[PDB]
């Protein structure tokens, strides 16, 4: 069985869930990126309208009742920066200490909070408060996520060749203001804070520059985005602040190149977490040389010890092969399976309706690698699959939860599992075609439909683990 009071719940993004019924928010870069006609006919976005979505902004108490019925006791909710501060906060100046380009200090004091108090949407603050109160009044675990890809238009405007939602110096200063603002009013409500959701996915896709060097100075801006935030938030909250990260079980092509595996894991993830926990930015300096861009200290205590917990996201593995001084995701396996077949992988394993092969052993592998390197409290903040007819999700949920249970027993300090997701939602560039929910949403009528896999969650939550009668669904390979 799982540990006592283990957290079974769901994760939610503001842009993917909120809109659909009322209170349309058009003030995000992703909204215009979704509606751009050239992006539609060039197959960058699906063309689906996010304002025709789940309606979680208004229907959240009824969707929370369904989570309660299936025994959930946790929720990860993302706050939209566009709704709290719909207008620019640049006019509010703050003390900013820098050196050779590294933002070492952003002093957010209480005279800044009341200054930001006049520009904030007090009605949007009350709506999020009502959503969070609806979660905590049921005795549930609450995790607030500040940033989930969508950025206010005054921060980034795709109008005026990628989305461009990266971080720069001016974006970091404004973000720490909004980060400290959230911790000022919700520091006693949120059980844990997450500054950003999958930032590695952002600075990988936010620019046409896929070079390793520019990838890491982009990551650098996100590194300071959390480090300077964490400082400002901890002024008003006593709760664990961490990062929700995109992860895949990195593997070499047939385990012949284990050094390339550790190469990939350091370039994409462990460079980030070694800076925010220890201060190792030798990657950032190593990059900054071949760029002729100014670099600072290689070990910065402004960045270090800035992770109280890690939000692990896992969906599939990631098999890679060395090319020329580089690596390539092997098509036909892992996240890149949907290129040789949409029904079976090269390993002969089932594939999700979005092209990601089902590899339940990877949720043990990714949790173990994170624990064996840092040993902090962790959480599965996202885990699920695109499966409309519920063909594979019942076996997906059980098999992954038992590989995670194998991880808890082996020492991993994971105290929560947040399935993605309770309901279907807007899967960004692919629209509503990708249905990840334990319950299915009819976007024409906004009606909620329980999928059978949601009743499997009801059985696991009731027993705090997988009973013997559900072990056949837990088979890893199918």
Residue numbers in the entry: 1 to 160, 167 to 484
Verbatim from the authors:
The genome of C. divulgatum encodes three GH1 enzyme candidates, from which CIB12 and CIB13 were heterologously expressed and characterized. Purified CIB12 and CIB13 were crystallized using the sitting-drop vapor diffusion method, and their crystal structures were determined to 2.55 Å and 2.22 Å resolution, respectively, by molecular replacement (see the section “Materials and methods” for details). Both structures revealed a classical (β/α)8 TIM-barrel fold with a spherical shape, which is typical for GH1 enzymes and is one of the most common protein folds. In the retaining catalytic mechanism of GH1 hydrolases, one of the two glutamates acts as an acid/base catalyst (Glu204 in CIB12 and CIB13) and the other acts as a nucleophile (Glu388 in CIB12 and Glu385 in CIB13). In this work, two representatives of glycosidases of GH1 family from C. divulgatum were characterized. Both CIB12 and CIB13 were active against cellobiose and lactose but showed substrate preference to cellobiose, and therefore were identified as cellobiohydrolases, EC 3.2.1.21.
In addition, the CIB12 structure contains two small antiparallel and one parallel β-sheets and six short α-helices, whereas CIB13 has four antiparallel β-sheets with two β-strands each and four α-helices outside the barrel structure. Both CIB12 and CIB13 structures revealed the presence of two protomers per asymmetric unit forming a dimer with interacting residues located primarily on two C-terminal α-helices, one side β-strand, and connecting loops. The cleavage of the glycosidic bond involves the formation of a covalent glucosyl-enzyme intermediate, which is then deglycosylated in a hydrolysis reaction via the attack of a water molecule producing the free enzyme and glucose. Both active sites show the presence of an additional area of electron density in each protomer located near the catalytic glutamates: Glu204 (3.9 Å) and Glu388 (2.8 Å) in CIB12 and Glu204 (3.5 Å) and Glu385 (2.8 Å) in CIB13. In CIB12, this density was interpreted as glycerol (two molecules in the CIB12 dimer), whereas the CIB13 dimer contained one molecule of glycerol in one protomer and one molecule of tris(hydroxymethyl)aminomethane (Tris) in the second protomer. The glycerol molecule in the CIB12 active site was also positioned close to the side chains of conserved His148 (3.1 Å), Trp149 (4.5 Å), Tyr321 (3.9 Å), Trp426 (4.1 Å), Glu433 (2.9 Å), and Trp434 (3.4 Å). Additionally, both active sites contained several aromatic and charged residues, which might contribute to substrate binding including Gln16, Trp30, Asn203, Glu207, Tyr341, Trp362, and Phe442 in CIB12 and Gln16, Trp30, Asn203, Phe340, Met357, and Trp359 in CIB13. The crystal structure of CIB12 also revealed the presence of the disulfide bond Cys172–Cys212 located near the active site, which is not conserved in CIB13 and might contribute to a higher thermotolerance of CIB12 activity compared to CIB13.
